[PDB]
Design a protein around this nucleic acid. Structure first.
Ligand SMILES: [Zn+2]
Lengths: 101, 215, 118, 154, 128, 84, 60
RNA sequence: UUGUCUAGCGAGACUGCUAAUGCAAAUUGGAGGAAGGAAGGGAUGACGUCAAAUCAUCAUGCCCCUUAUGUCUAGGGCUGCAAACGUGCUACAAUGGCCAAUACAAACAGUCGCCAGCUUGUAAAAGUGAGCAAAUCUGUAAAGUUGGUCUCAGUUCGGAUUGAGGGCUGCAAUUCGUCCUCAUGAAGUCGGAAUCACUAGUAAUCGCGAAUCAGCUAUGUCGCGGUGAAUACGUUCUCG
RNA sequence: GGUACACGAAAAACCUUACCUAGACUUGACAUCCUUGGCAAAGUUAUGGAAACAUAAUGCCGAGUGACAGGU
């Protein structure tokens, strides 16, 4: 082993893409590695930005966009160093940004 | 006054055009203002390539610009003389430490993309072609390709003053009100000799039932 | 120097009626001179008044605050100073808007006719 | 125009067992705070047991019965110098207006503290004095004076 | 014999536990009394009005934990949890609980503050 | 108030005023920094402070201590309201 | 006088408080978003274009 | 005194069934049910009108300037002042003033920042110094309850104005910032013709968060939750 | 006018800033093309100045040339 508690945390601005990535990781880790509790939903940090529509005053009609940022979490009980060797080839997409322990 | 038909379905029926992230608001602004420059360079400098759109993909000092153009060879050039040139402007506008690895791929049935058709409208109008017959030829050639209804309208100086003489064209089912519609939208500025001509094209490209989410 | 301290009320705020004693230093003197709250002005032993007078004399003389305010005003006015210049015209000095507001010091109102709109 | 509007329901208070008491506590409420008006009204209740020892429910219903107005006034004009028209109003709005009069007249008096002024208001309403019965009597006296208009109206 | 439930009125959750005990029920909410937690109003009376149309605190313990909202939302959540708990204890209570409209999650919640409107409904003012 | 070396000057105006004060104390010297406060040494000279158009002279006196240099120079005129 | 404002905004300022925020593409010195370095109307046009990675329509 | 909870999927509600009346859409009633007859809300706004607004986002033809209407720099002015209007805030007091104990959110944000706890400081704050890239750590909810004082009056309401002493950012606070403490306490005891908002978790009202930004009497704006109403009989008039 | 008046502006002590006064500058603060190259670019410290700045020195950048650049 020599590396217990691989606490990988994945965060993205999309849900179905992050769900696909976590499904792929849970299926690939379902091989050599064991004792991996399932995906951990997180409160999906959210913000709203509001912008006036017209180039001129027209204040009474303004719209607003929203940059959603979904969040999940994984914990790995032990490395099983061959498992990280298999892990080296995952090539996750750019939309999901990783953060391990 | 109505909303841009692209934005309403964008992010829930259409995948984003530039997927990337960086350190929180430190230089994400820099990356956006940089890759929009690449996008503008593609849509501006090379009219002859009819680039439909560009995909920007950055992750921590790497970039890959997928392109979809009707005619790839003009971007490629003769014996690859133009690809190296265009990639060196991309480099000098992006820096030097970042790999580029551009790719160019022809787009199947390009004539169903509003971008290239609007560009053709701009080229025709700027060339003093009578606007009505150009509209009709472009409309027929687009519709014959097997698509659904079209909406092309043009404002600006229609060969003279009193611009409130604007022509609009609608030729079938194109439901803005339906979110699950798979509609395309574009816009070009046909810089005529008398001012600015804005051409707008709406393309209905079939039903998008059972999509679930973005592609 | 006992200036109109009425009865049927507590001494803590009775001390305030002289010119220059807010409630803050009123409670300060209240605690300094062992005076106990919830005791009306009436039924007050003579012993506390002398201590109150002494501690007040230790502080700034209540009638002399007007003296000092006038002294500061004339001291800043005698030198040509924009703050004094503004203070003379009975208009606020602390930078408040003068376009329409700041009428608590200029007087109630003096209306004047505007343009002949037509 | 519009159609008929359904009414939201009001639940009786299961301690004194009267929904009219609930409408009391609702109307006398300000700022949207049931607690403060609740304490005020219950202190008024305790005062009802305190002086003039009698069932608070009985004096309550007596006040309601005395303050209630028999007829209402409705405006139907033709030209300048408009003319009133007295029409019939159902009991729900009658008791609503009685409660409104009690509430408004209570906060119009001497005896600054709310407890005693509202208690005196309910006492006077039970005893038929000029506090609120005067207003009801006046509004009744304008009625049936021009009842010719009431008979032929729409 | 524990009996369960759940209430979610106005952003306020409420988990309940009910057991038929020796006493009248020994009301205990959040391990403390309702009298000092909830000010003595009709709000404390609201929880036993489900019981009034039933065996009114004959033998039914109260073990409730509360989170979220203010106190009125807490009261609604715990009331709905109680009515669900009686329904779980006895199906025969649907006809009398639903007739009085005690269940069904009134779902009256503060709306979203719409732009251009001060409190999502008030316009600033009108001027000509 | 600065609360730490409260008497504040642009720190470039010190050298010339100190020089002149030890150089027979010439009165007319052109200054633009309405930013500065006066040290106790300042008393004695005149300065052609700039308001925004031209230079107006101010004579410093020991009568006042601590007040800002530029406050002596009004910048905005009076009402001068016409009838209508 | 706009292009000179462009070049002045870029230069290193003599003072920490001298400089201010501004959109890169255009010189509108108002309503610029520090989280995107892009003007509010510029942000709207690029978001309808969709260059920003995460943009939706608010339903919230 | 645990399955709350969060976020993914699925179910659920589709006039589904029954009653009536109608050709049929459909209408109403009932049962079931969390919700029943467009469930609450948002996003979404046709052809066009007002030569509506924006050449000062941007692009933009034409015209004009060019050792200047262009470039940099210091100061000022965008904050004035006889006056009037508009939108807000505090109120004009015992439903309240003040003091002590006192518990109850949600959402959002934060490693040049949030700032825990501690020390000094009547205080603005200053210092020490963790934890926190964050459901962990931090950003004390206020209303509310209990107790007490106040006892109806230009006041123990009200806070302007003004004077002084402190604090913070910032090179720097006089035009031209802001906070704290001390000092005084304008006027106002509900307001003329006339008007505005609102059909429920709404009004009112209590607070809380964010943005631009080092600083900002933003009382503004954009958002979150706490407490928490009346009435719609009816369309004769009024507005469109 | 409704559809303007806590509006542009989601923040003017300097900048912002577009105005005024004053100081200074002119293929220019900034861009390309023509010709010619390869080491300084910024920032730092004296110096007069209020500061642009002229200085003297440390550590992609230059020099001559018109279309012109530029105009809130
Ligand atoms: Zn911009």
């Amino acid at each position: 082993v020599k590396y217990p508690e691989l606490k990988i945390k994945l965060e993205s601005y999309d849900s179905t893409l992050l769900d696909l990535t976590t499904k792929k990781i849970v299926e690939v880790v379902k091989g050599v590695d064991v004792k991996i509790k399932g995906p951990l939903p997180l409160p999906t940090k959210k913000e709203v930005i509001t912008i006036i529509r017209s180039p001129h005053v027209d204040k009474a009609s303004r719209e607003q966009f929203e940059k959603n940022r979904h969040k999940r979490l994984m914990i790995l009980v032990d490395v099983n160093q061959g498992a990280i060797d298999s892990l080296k080839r995952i090539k996750i997409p750019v939309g999901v940004t990783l953060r391990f322990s | 006054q109505k909303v841009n038909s692209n934005g309403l379905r964008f992010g829930i029926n259409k995948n984003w055009i530039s997927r990337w992230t960086a350190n929180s608001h430190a230089q994400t602004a820099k990356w956006l203002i940089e890759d929009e420059k690449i996008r503008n360079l593609f849509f501006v400098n090379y009219r002859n390539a009819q680039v439909s759109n560009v995909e920007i993909e950055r992750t921590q000092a790497t970039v890959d610009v997928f392109v979809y153009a009707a005619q790839p060879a003009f971007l490629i050039g003769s014996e690859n003389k133009n690809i190296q040139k265009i990639t060196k402007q991309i480099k000098q506008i992006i820096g030097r430490t970042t790999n580029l690895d551009l790719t160019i791929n022809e787009i199947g049935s390009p004539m169903l993309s509003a971008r290239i058709i609007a560009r053709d409208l701009a080229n025709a109008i700027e060339a003093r072609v009578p606007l009505r017959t150009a509209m009709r030829q472009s409309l027929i050639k687009v519709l014959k390709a097997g698509a659904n209804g079209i909406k092309v309208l043009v404002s600006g100086r229609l060969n003279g003053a009193e611009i409130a003489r604007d022509k609009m064209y609608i030729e079938g089912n194109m439901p803005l009100s339906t979110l699950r519609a798979d509609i395309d939208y574009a816009l070009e500025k046909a810089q005529t000799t008398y001012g600015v001509i804005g051409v707008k094209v709406w393309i209905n490209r079939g039903m998008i039932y059972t999509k679930g989410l973005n592609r | 120097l006992g200036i109109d301290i009425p009865n049927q009320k507590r001494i803590e705020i009775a001390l305030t009626y002289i010119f220059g004693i807010g409630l803050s230093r009123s409670q300060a003197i209240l605690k300094q001179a062992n005076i106990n709250p919830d005791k009306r002005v009436k039924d007050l032993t003579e012993e506390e008044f002398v201590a109150i007078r002494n501690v007040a004399s230790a502080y700034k003389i209540e009638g002399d605050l007007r003296r000092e305010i006038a002294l500061n005003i004339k001291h800043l006015s005698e030198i040509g100073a924009w703050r004094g210049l503004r203070h003379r015209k009975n208009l606020p000095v602390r930078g408040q808007r003068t376009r329409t507001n700041a009428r608590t010091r200029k007087g109630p109102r003096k209306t004047v006719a505007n343009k002949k709109i037509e | 125009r519009k159609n008929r509007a359904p009414k939201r329901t009001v639940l009786p208070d299961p301690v004194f067992n009267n929904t009219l008491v609930t409408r009391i506590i609702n109307v006398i409420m300000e700022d949207g705070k049931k607690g403060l008006a609740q304490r005020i009204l219950y202190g008024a209740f305790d005062l009802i047991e305190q002086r003039t020892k009698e069932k608070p429910l009985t004096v309550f219903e007596r006040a309601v019965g005395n303050v209630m107005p028999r007829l209402e006034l409705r405006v139907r004009r033709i030209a300048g110098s408009n003319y009133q028209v007295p029409t019939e109003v159902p009991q729900d709005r009658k008791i609503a207006l009685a409660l409104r009069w009690i509430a408004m007249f209570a906060r119009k008096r001497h005896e600054k503290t709310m407890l005693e002024k509202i208690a005196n208001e309910i006492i006077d309403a039970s005893n038929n004095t000029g506090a609120a019965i005067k207003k009801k009597d006046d509004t009744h006296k304008m009625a049936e004076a021009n009842k010719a208009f009431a008979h032929m109206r729409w | 014999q524990s009996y369960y439930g759940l209430g979610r009125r106005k952003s306020s959750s409420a988990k309940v536990y009910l057991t038929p005990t020796q006493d009248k029920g020994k009301i205990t909410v959040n391990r403390r009394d309702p009298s000092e937690y909830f000010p003595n109003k009709l709000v404390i009376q609201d929880m036993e009005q489900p019981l009034d149309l039933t065996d009114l605190k004959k033998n039914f313990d109260i073990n409730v934990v509360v989170k979220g909202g203010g106190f009125t939302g807490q009261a609604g959540a715990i009331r709905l949890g109680i009515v669900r708990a009686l329904l779980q204890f006895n199906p025969e209570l649907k006809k009398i609980l639903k007739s009085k409209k005690l269940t069904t999650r009134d779902k009256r919640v503060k709306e979203r503050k719409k732009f251009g409107l001060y409190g999502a409904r008030r316009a600033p003012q009108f001027t000509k | 108030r600065s609360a730490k070396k409260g008497a504040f000057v642009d720190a470039h105006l010190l050298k010339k005023v100190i020089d002149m004060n030890k150089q027979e104390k010439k009165r007319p010297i052109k200054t633009w920094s309405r930013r500065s406060t006066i040290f106790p040494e300042f008393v004695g000279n005149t300065f052609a402070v700039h308001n925004g158009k031209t230079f107006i002279n101010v004579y410093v006196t020991d009568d006042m201590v601590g007040h800002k240099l530029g406050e002596f120079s009004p910048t905005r005129n009076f009402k001068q309201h016409t009838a209508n | 006088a706009k292009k000179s404002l462009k070049v002045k905004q870029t230069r290193i300022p003599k003072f920490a408080v001298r400089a201010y925020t501004r959109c890169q593409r255009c010189g509108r010195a108002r309503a610029v978003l520090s989280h995107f370095g892009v003007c509010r109307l510029c942000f709207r046009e690029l978001a309808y274009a969709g260059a920003i990675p995460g943009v939706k329509k608010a339903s919230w």
